[PDB]
Structure 1
C-alpha cells in the first residue's frame, strides 16, 4: 500500500509486539496468589492490553516494518479517521473558545471599569456568552460581511516606521 506499508492485521511484526507485551505481564503475574489485589490488577491490565491490539487490527491502520501504526495525512478520505475527522473536531472546539472569549472582551469594554471584569469575572454574563459559540461559523461569518470583524486602518496605533 501507500509507502510500501502493510495493514496492521496482516503485519507479522505487529503480531509479535502483541505477544511480547502479554508475555511480559504474565511473567509478572505468576508471583502472586490468584484472588489477591495484585493478581486482579495485572489480569485487568492484560485484558486492557489485549483489547488494545484487537482494536487496531480491525481499525484499518497501516503498519511498517517496525510493527507500529502509522498515520496518513495526505488528504486521503480512506484514512479520514486519522486526521480529518479529529481535525474538524478540534477546529470546532478551538474556534468556539476564541469566539466566546472575544465576545466577552467586547461586551465589558463599554463600561466604567473594563479591567475590573477581567480579574473578577461577571460569571452570570460569562456563562451566558460561553454557550453562544455553538454556532460560531455562522456568527463569525455574519460579522465578516458586516464590518464588525476587522477594524479600519485608521484605528490601529502603528510604530513610527509605518
Structure 2
C-alpha cells in the first residue's frame, strides 16, 4: 500500500503483538485469587487492551513490518483523521487562547498602573473576555482587513 504498509486488520504482526501482550497480562493474573481486587484490576486491563487493538483495527490505520501503527501526514484523504483534522482542532484552540490573551493585554494597557493587573488578574474582566475566542477567526480576519491587527509604525 502507501509506502509499502499493509492494513492492521490484514497484518499478522499486529495480531501477534495483541495476543502476546494479552497472555502476558493473563500470566501475571493467575494469582491472588480468581476474584480478589487485583484479579479484577488485571481483567479490566485485559479488556481495555482488546478494545484498543480492535479500535485501531476499525479505524483503518497502516502497519509495517514491526507490527505497530504508522502515520500518513501527506494530505491523502483516507488519513485526515491522523493529522489534518486534529491539526485544525489544535489551530482553532491555540488561536482561541492567544486571541483572548492579546485582547486582555490590550484592554488593560491604558490603566495608570498596568503592571498591577499583570501580576494580579482582573477576573471579572477576563470572564467577559474568555468567550470572544469562540469567534476569534472572524474577528481576526476583519481585524486584518481593518489595518487593525498590526501595530502601525513599528
Q: TM-score normalized by structure 2? A: 0.98
Match of 1:135 in 2: 135
Question: Would you say 1:145 and 2:150 are equivalent positions?
Answer: no
Match of 2:15 in 1: 15
Runs (4+) of structure 1 exceeding 6 A deviation are none
Unaligned stretches of 5+ in structure 1? 157-162
RMSD: 0.7
1:74-89 residue pairs with structure 2 within 5 A?
74-89=74-89
Aligned with 2:73: secondary structure? coil
CA displacement 1:42-101 (0-9 Å, x = unmatched) = 000000001111111111000001000001000011100000110000011000000000
Which position in structure 2 is the counterpart of 1:159? none
Distance across 2 between alignment mates of 1:73 and 1:108: 41
Q: Equivalents in 1 of 2:147, 2:79: separation in Å?
A: 39
- Confirm whether residue 125 of structure 1 aligns to residue 137 of structure 2: no
Deviation (angstroms), 1:32: 2.1
Number of aligned pairs? 154
1:110 aligns with 2:110: yes
Q: How far off its partner does 1:34 sit?
A: 1.4
Distance (whole Å) between structure 2 residues aligned to residue 53 and residue 144 of structure 1? 46
Q: TM-score, normalised by structure 1?
A: 0.93
Q: 1:124 deviation in Å?
A: 0.3
TM-fit CA distance, 1:152:
2.0
The equivalent residue for 2:55 is 55
| SS, match of residue 72 in structure 2 | coil
